Design an enzyme around this catalytic site. Structure first.
Site, PDB file in Angstrom:
ATOM      1  N   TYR A 150      -0.444  -3.083  -4.196  1.00  0.00           N
ATOM      2  CA  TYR A 150      -0.428  -2.470  -3.090  1.00  0.00           C
ATOM      3  C   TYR A 150      -1.685  -2.340  -2.200  1.00  0.00           C
ATOM      4  O   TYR A 150      -1.881  -2.729  -1.063  1.00  0.00           O
ATOM      5  CB  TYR A 150       0.148  -0.877  -3.173  1.00  0.00           C
ATOM      6  N   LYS A 154      -2.950  -4.012   1.430  1.00  0.00           N
ATOM      7  CA  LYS A 154      -3.412  -3.147   2.763  1.00  0.00           C
ATOM      8  C   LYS A 154      -4.759  -3.729   2.926  1.00  0.00           C
ATOM      9  O   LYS A 154      -5.142  -4.015   4.040  1.00  0.00           O
ATOM     10  CB  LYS A 154      -3.448  -1.691   2.417  1.00  0.00           C
ATOM     11  N   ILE A 183       0.297  10.962   3.932  1.00  0.00           N
ATOM     12  CA  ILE A 183       1.060  11.388   4.951  1.00  0.00           C
ATOM     13  C   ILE A 183       2.491  11.805   4.173  1.00  0.00           C
ATOM     14  O   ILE A 183       3.101  11.144   3.325  1.00  0.00           O
ATOM     15  CB  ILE A 183       1.375  10.453   5.953  1.00  0.00           C
TER      16      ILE A 183
END
Ligand SMILES: NC(=O)c1ccc[n+]([C@@H]2O[C@H](COP(=O)([O-])OP(=O)(O)OC[C@H]3O[C@@H](n4cnc5c(N)ncnc54)[C@H](O)[C@@H]3O)[C@@H](O)[C@H]2O)c1
Ligand SMILES: NC(=O)c1ccc[n+]([C@@H]2O[C@H](COP(=O)([O-])OP(=O)(O)OC[C@H]3O[C@@H](n4cnc5c(N)ncnc54)[C@H](O)[C@@H]3O)[C@@H](O)[C@H]2O)c1
Ligand SMILES: NC(=O)c1ccc[n+]([C@@H]2O[C@H](COP(=O)([O-])OP(=O)(O)OC[C@H]3O[C@@H](n4cnc5c(N)ncnc54)[C@H](O)[C@@H]3O)[C@@H](O)[C@H]2O)c1
Ligand SMILES: NC(=O)c1ccc[n+]([C@@H]2O[C@H](COP(=O)([O-])OP(=O)(O)OC[C@H]3O[C@@H](n4cnc5c(N)ncnc54)[C@H](O)[C@@H]3O)[C@@H](O)[C@H]2O)c1
Ligand SMILES: OC[C@H]1O[C@@H](O)[C@H](O)[C@@H](O)[C@@H]1O
Ligand SMILES: OC[C@H]1O[C@@H](O)[C@H](O)[C@@H](O)[C@@H]1O
Ligand SMILES: OC[C@H]1O[C@@H](O)[C@H](O)[C@@H](O)[C@@H]1O
Ligand SMILES: OC[C@H]1O[C@@H](O)[C@H](O)[C@@H](O)[C@@H]1O
Ligand SMILES: O=[N+]([O-])c1ccc(F)c(O)c1
Ligand SMILES: O=[N+]([O-])c1ccc(F)c(O)c1
Ligand SMILES: O=[N+]([O-])c1ccc(F)c(O)c1
Ligand SMILES: O=[N+]([O-])c1ccc(F)c(O)c1
Ligand code: NA
Ligand code: NA
Ligand code: NA
Ligand code: NA
Lengths: 256, 256, 256, 256
Positions: A150, A154, A183
């Site tokens: 991951y 990014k 978030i």
């Protein structure tokens, strides 16, 4: 009216950060195309929001994306902003538990889907002097534990944003990214539910920020509307929406 | 109405970037106190803009700043945002041409004036859950030639922004900075006029950005209004308003 | 004797930066396994350097890499450092001239080959409390024109380095990267030869650095030996070997 | 012999990181001038190390520094490297507990003392194609709580390093900085002794690093010897010696 008369595509816009971005652009006066591989959230959002329509589209399928762009132009006559938000965070994985093939699959969603939509949209963005907004992550910049694939995807998105900004600058097309920190979204909630103590996992995520809370999709949405509508001298930037998680010392683990 | 009912102080607001920030906040619905050591520009701005008033104040004079804050509260009853924009860039100076005392004087304006106003304003910003916006510079991050003292002052401002963000986070007060690159202002024009070929100096400054132009005070102003009014999960960030000047390779001067 | 008794694998070690790293480690007292998909340079290097042997290995072929690691252990009994240097920079490509499949192929070399060797080596690096050094690029951090896929792969490598550093820190295994800028290598020379004016292309590359020259493979090699042998409190860092190319303003292209 | 025949000045070299740097350069073959405002540690170090001599010098006193440079040249005939390590971290101070005058005093030590010695040394460093190494701090980059003045001084040092690197690059003089994280030194021990629970304070400092320990002066010293002796293509860099403290999420304090 900050972005009235403009047409925006948001990938992965059916829930989470993507839906918050959809709502922010509709509130700014734009027409929004909600792209998502799942029908449930996006179709309901289209019914809810007058300035938004849903197009089923898997960003890893090049023909889905070609149709997304051609349908956007056919239905609305222009394209001003592409928000590449679709992406996934796998559950925690130790490095020896990852595979090259799983890494390839995550690159396909998080990086190449962003690449493909951007490529197909750029001819129209050039005509409108539009802009690209990629949703990256703070962990591309600072790393994260148990997330080698991951984090790598990014890091690629943030770097690609800068390369593309250089290439498209002579055409007046800006390319920027937003790097959210924690978030509170359905993905965050799903991932916490896999943990031994979900409540402890959520509290730890809240306290990773000096502000002591996680962020909201609406806050990422406001940053996106800013980059699209009012940041005309910003290109190639990485806008941190993280509550200060990258600041100061914290618990990451006398001199031997 | 994005920042309606709020009260903003902008230092060095009489011309240049500061005036662009003043105008942006007035357009957002805020009342603005224009602080400047020079009367000419700021007094005319007060006459021009209904939501703005001018207070003569040299940010290097602690008693001037104390009066600035107490007059703001006396006249408007609250304080929501402080924009520390006052600052100066000396003409180009080779390192051996600088002095410790000249360095001290530039620290007094560019760094300690920002520190002093922020300190005096924080009790009121805590009551309003307001925020601080410091105007730093891209060259604090990447360096600049013939500007050792100036670069050092802006490196200090950007770092101080992060420290203060950590300290004030438990009180809900956000602290952020904007790092402009080349913005076309009276200071830029004054500095170019000192060069052998001013037109060549200005063209070089324009081409330092991939976008091929310098920025506008209004663009810095829009970034400031974003940070004040819509960036509720941003604290300690450095918002680049640079046209991409930091991106890619350029002319800065086979392997010996 | 700085790294005496240690065993190092260098991928792409047959020429260029990789060969400079091989030479630096041999000079430090280490035994070095030169991995390369091409026999010409690496086989000659083995004949030249007593402390170095050549193993033919394409890092995109997982079975080649498995054999590289097992042969290293069989022949030398330990593994202390892996330098993931193999990689390629395509000729300049405008964004619309790239393809998803070409992007996938470059990810396979520049990113997944690094991932695969690191994964297979980590069990042995844990036993030796060894370390990983990835060769990324400055353009992963700041972008480059006409190189969207390449820039994306190096952004991924730099980010992956930080993620892996976090994961392996409890085992005492450090993971760092070096980001070179313009280094004079056969790849640089090959790429310049494709340009309309190769000499002008090379002079432009030299002047992209404040130091006014490109770097040498030996200078990247010295940084690698430092990270392996003397940087015991460094993990997850990005060591810039760039001659200052990222510093200051340059030519990248009054306020409209 | 890595730095044999070279002459190095280390400020604040009587204890802590500075003494570790002194020892590293002596071990590399250099002659070292130990500068310190306190006689105790530095005088003992001179007696201990054949290649080192002690000169009493307060870097905030310009005449002390002038004499330091002229005595170095008089006694050793050249100057190759200046390590600006002298500096202080005050006890934790909330922002409202700081003063402008205390801020000025800390700027005098941490920033202007570095500036003054560098300025007086540069004519000799130009003759030797020598280099400057400034000891900054990771907290200049990422911030720290209860340390607004300290953080600001180190942000200034790191930025100043980049500006000076640009200015001195045409003369072949490199200017770099090292940003340590938590290094176990007498200052760290003194500061912990002021805390309610010193042992808890020290354990917290150890766990701020993924490596789970603090760093050693010898590790900062090795980074300095690398920058001086083997980093000929590095200028304007910030070498992190932090054990990974800047990596990943940590405890810094669901979406409101
Ligand atoms: N949540 C966080 O804390 C966080 C932090 C940093 C970055 N991000 C990034 O923000 C983005 C959104 O994250 P989120 O938390 O809202 O996730 P989410 O899972 O809640 O929502 C993602 C949406 O994208 C859709 N989607 C997934 N794969 C798709 C595909 N192939 N084609 C089209 N749509 C697809 C999903 O159906 C879903 O509607 C991702 O890029 C993620 O990496 C999230
Ligand atoms: N112009 C650029 O390209 C650029 C780039 C990066 C950062 N900046 C920063 O932006 C800010 C504004 O720059 P500008 O170009 O608009 O400058 P400017 O000279 O055009 O305007 C600065 C204003 O501040 C006022 N001022 C100066 N000293 C003051 C003091 N002691 N007290 C109160 N007011 C004072 C001046 O009177 C003037 O009205 C500065 O902090 C500068 O460092 C400018
Ligand atoms: N030269 C520069 O200016 C520069 C700058 C930044 C980063 N880099 C990076 O440094 C590394 C080396 O670059 P270079 O300029 O020395 O290149 P180069 O082409 O001169 O040498 C690369 C070597 O790697 C080998 N190689 C290529 N693909 C391989 C594979 N699949 N398996 C095994 N070996 C393989 C080649 O045969 C060659 O020997 C690359 O990762 C490159 O991206 C180079
Ligand atoms: N210890 C850490 O964790 C850490 C982390 C990051 C940066 N640093 C920096 O490293 C440097 C050394 O820190 P330390 O922990 O070794 O400190 P220390 O207090 O243990 O040693 C500092 C030395 O500098 C001397 N000194 C102080 N003021 C001086 C002056 N005016 N003139 C001459 N000498 C002077 C002191 O007498 C002492 O010998 C400082 O710049 C500090 O900011 C330390
Ligand atoms: O599922 C966790 C959160 O996800 C967000 O996208 C929604 O807006 C919230 O309603 C919800 O609390
Ligand atoms: O003086 C150069 C520029 O400065 C800016 O602050 C003004 O808004 C412009 O009118 C002017 O062209
Ligand atoms: O081919 C360009 C350069 O490549 C480097 O790897 C070699 O060490 C040099 O001999 C050569 O000048
Ligand atoms: O005082 C704490 C530490 O400071 C370091 O400078 C010394 O080398 C150590 O001996 C000591 O344990
Ligand atoms: O920082 N991220 O990218 C991130 C953090 C937490 C998540 F649950 C997530 O899905 C992504
Ligand atoms: O990048 N700066 O801080 C900057 C650039 C140019 C100027 F004329 C100036 O006054 C400030
Ligand atoms: O910065 N780079 O990664 C880079 C620069 C120039 C090259 F020729 C190259 O092959 C790679
Ligand atoms: O990160 N620093 O600069 C730092 C950390 C801890 C200390 F005790 C100190 O004196 C300095
Ligand atoms: Na609708
Ligand atoms: Na008015
Ligand atoms: Na051999
Ligand atoms: Na001695």
């Amino acid at each position: 009216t900050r972005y009235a008369g403009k047409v925006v595509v948001v990938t992965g816009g059916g829930r989470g950060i993507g839906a918050g971005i959809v709502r922010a652009f509709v509130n700014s006066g734009a027409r929004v195309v909600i792209c998502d591989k799942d029908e449930s959230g996006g179709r309901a959002l289209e019914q809810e929001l007058p300035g938004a329509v849903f197009i089923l589209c898997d960003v890893t399928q090049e023909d889905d994306v070609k149709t997304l762009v051609s349908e956007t132009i056919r239905r609305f006559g222009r394209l001003d902003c592409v928000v590449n938000n679709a992406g996934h965070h796998p559950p925690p994985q130790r490095p020896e538990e990852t595979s090259a093939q799983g890494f390839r699959q995550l690159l396909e969603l998080n990086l190449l889907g962003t690449y493909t939509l951007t490529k197909l949209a750029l001819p129209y963005l050039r005509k409108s002097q539009g802009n690209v907004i990629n949703i990256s992550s703070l962990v591309g910049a600072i790393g994260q534990a148990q997330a080698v694939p991951y984090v790598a995807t990014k890091g690629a998105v943030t770097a690609m944003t800068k390369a593309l900004a250089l290439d498209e600058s002579p055409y007046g097309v800006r390319v920027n990214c937003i790097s959210p920190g924690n978030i509170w979204t359905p993905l965050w909630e799903e991932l916490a539910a896999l943990m031994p103590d979900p409540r402890a996992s959520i509290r730890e995520g809240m306290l990773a920020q000096p502000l002591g809370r996680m962020g909201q999709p609406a806050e990422v949405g406001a940053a996106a509307v800013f980059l699209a509508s009012e940041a005309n001298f910003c290109t190639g930037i990485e806008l941190l929406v993280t509550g200060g998680a990258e600041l100061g010392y914290g618990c990451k683990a006398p001199d031997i």
